[PDB]
Symmetry: C2
Subunit: 140 residues, 2 copies
């Protein structure tokens, strides 16, 4: 019963444990729908995969309850329905990113043994600052 | 810190949203002073000094001092890409964005001073259509 709002490849810096940062081409899928346990709870789903690595799967599921905790931590000002639209804008900046840009937007995925932290940062002439930080889980 | 051999890079009042630990909340105009120089004990150690004051309240003092050694730890945490010498200049640009901030701007830059019982945290945040995100965060100490 899920509906896909977003399905495009996104350039992402993948950082695995004891490796080094490497720019991989990852597929992003954003879906809206209801929980498997409860049809009254709206769920926002984000799936990260790869065409090269068929076993590279990372997933985030955000309920309206989880979004409340996310609003407090990340300082989000929008509603639940407006949340995917804001992510897509940030993702597009990573897609159209060029070396000569300032500020320059980048997507980073850091994996640490069953825990993966995804973020989209801004690189300017001063520093690197995150625009969003989300916790992902390995698998589907 | 040698105050006589110090060079003032920035000295003007700056619009800052002041949060006085749930005692009062007021958008007041505070005076910022950024100075570069060397330590009084050692003239080989470069020091960066930032002083926050007020023209109305003469006992409102907050100060931050960052040495070149301390800057390395700050560089790693805040993800700073410039050197110690370029560091003050970038702060002034962020401060200027708060000065030229307008209600119709997007993104809009704001300066925030949060006091927490003998502890003061200064930051410059960005307000866009999505969220509030900090561009810089500095820990200040009450007094001179």
């Amino acid at each position: 019963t899920a509906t896909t709002l977003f399905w495009r490849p996104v350039p992402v810096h993948v950082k695995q444990q004891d490796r080094e940062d490497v720019l991989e081409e990852l597929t992003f899928r954003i879906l809206t729908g209801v929980a498997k346990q409860n049809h009254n709870l709206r769920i926002l789903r984000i799936h990260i995969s790869s065409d090269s690595d068929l076993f590279f799967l990372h997933t985030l599921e955000v309920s309206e309850e989880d979004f409340q905790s996310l609003k407090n931590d990340e300082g989000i000002l929008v509603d639940f329905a407006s949340f995917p639209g804001k992510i897509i804008s940030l993702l597009e900046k990573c897609i159209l990113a060029q070396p000569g840009d300032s500020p320059r937007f980048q997507a980073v995925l850091t994996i640490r043994g069953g825990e993966s932290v995804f973020k989209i940062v801004e690189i300017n002439d001063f520093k690197q600052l995150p625009h969003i930080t989300l916790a992902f889980r390995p698998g589907n």
